[PDB]
Design a protein around this nucleic acid. Structure first.
Length: 160
RNA sequence: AAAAAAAAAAAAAAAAAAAAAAAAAAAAAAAAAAAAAAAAAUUUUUUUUUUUUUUUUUUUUUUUUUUUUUUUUUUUUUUUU
């Protein structure tokens, strides 16, 4: 399934959210790149056990609802590049990161803070997932002290 | 039955000024590409024309030695016409 350039922004709170992807057991790869998505409603990735790849790049996603990815235990490649993601919380990207093979969320305004990327930095340091251009296109945007700094070059020993 | 003033809801149509977006086209600025082309700085091949060194074949010329003939001017001596 591909939904590139289809402006699904407003389709996902007024008038009742659309419960798309209902019972798509055999769905392999879902692609909603550059659809202007702004907010992900809860309970939309359920029952997608056999899903393999997710591509949600070229969008504006900052509100990462907890437990959005629960049945995505078979995810092989997560694409979130060129988005507005600020924090990477464990409860959102946990199950998809259990057996992920490749990851791509470059060109994002990352927040180099203990509340945002500590879990992400620890996972990156403790995984073998293929992340292209990890040291180049993963610079943080805030605060000023950590602005323009590599994501991997962040010490999490002072926050736990 | 009908017409009107203040107070309250409003549904539809015709227009507009804004905000959040999204495809499409057209402009530029950077990373690459495939090429038909262009030089320049390092190797060397083939061919033509010519220089120098060296080894030898043919022809010609000079000199020295040896030798065979056509001519010889001499004959010391020998028998004589």
């Amino acid at each position: 399934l591909d939904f590139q350039h289809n402006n699904l922004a407003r389709l996902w709170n007024p008038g009742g959210p659309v419960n798309f992807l209902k019972g798509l057991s055999h769905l392999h790869i879902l692609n909603l790149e550059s659809n202007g998505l702004d907010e992900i409603p809860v309970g939309v990735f359920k029952n997608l056990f056999e899903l393999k790849s997710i591509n949600l790049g070229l969008n504006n996603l900052n509100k990462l609802e907890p437990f959005i990815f629960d049945d995505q235990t078979s995810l092989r490649s997560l694409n979130l590049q060129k988005n507005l993601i600020t924090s990477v919380e464990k409860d959102v990207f946990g199950p998809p990161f259990q057996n992920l093979n490749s990851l791509d969320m470059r060109f994002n305004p990352f927040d180099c803070t203990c509340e945002s990327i500590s879990w992400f930095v620890n996972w990156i340091n403790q995984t073998h997932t293929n992340i292209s251009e990890l040291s180049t296109h993963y610079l943080c945007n805030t605060p000023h002290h950590y602005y323009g700094f590599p994501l991997k070059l962040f010490d999490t020993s002072s926050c736990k």
